Copies of this chain bind each other. A is one copy, B any other.
Amino acid sequence: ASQVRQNYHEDCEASINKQINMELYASYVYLSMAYYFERDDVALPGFAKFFKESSDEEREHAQTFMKYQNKRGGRIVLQQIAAPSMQEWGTGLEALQAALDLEKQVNQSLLELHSTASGNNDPHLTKLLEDEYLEEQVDSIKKIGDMITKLKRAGPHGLGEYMFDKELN
């Protein structure tokens, strides 16, 4: 084993590698959305900026897990990153609804990782998940939920979508 490895279960190591792939996938989905909203026939620059920054954040989430893997003496194994589920994302509201669903899927995976870490009595890893991931995920889900409600109020189509887009820009 690695000279640093201590109290680090192989199941947690493997689950971290799977989570790295999921974070990279989420980054790719948000990158797709970002440039969809810069199409000349879409032109929603607030949504584009929101999803560009979300894509950057998920790439950083993946990197933080890669750093963690190395810190504990596990070994990073990278797999193919799936194509985003769509090439075109529809309205601003439909993209936010897809984002909410994705964030909740990621949250479920993080909670399953926490259960794996708890069951293997790894408090360093439950700590990482609670402080660096679970809090960010709940905050993101509440923010996107708020955004869906505000957009449904303002629009969700036409002038209201145009005006809501400005609050993101």
Residues of A at the B interface (CB closer than 8 Å) are 2-4, 6-7, 28, 31-32, 35-36, 38-43, 59, 63, 66-67, 69-73, 75-84, 87, 100, 104, 107-108, 111, 114-115, 118, 121, 123-124, 126-127, 129-131, 134-135, 138-139, 141-142, 145-150, 153-155, 158-164, 166-167
Contact = CB atoms under 8 A, between A and B. Distances in A.
How many copies altogether? 4
Nearest to A82: B80
Main secondary structure of the interface of A (DSSP, over half): helix
Contacts of A2: 40-41, 145
Contact of A159 (B127, B131, B160): B160
A145 B4 contact: yes
B78 A146 contact: no
B135 A127 contact: yes
A48 to B, nearest CB: 10
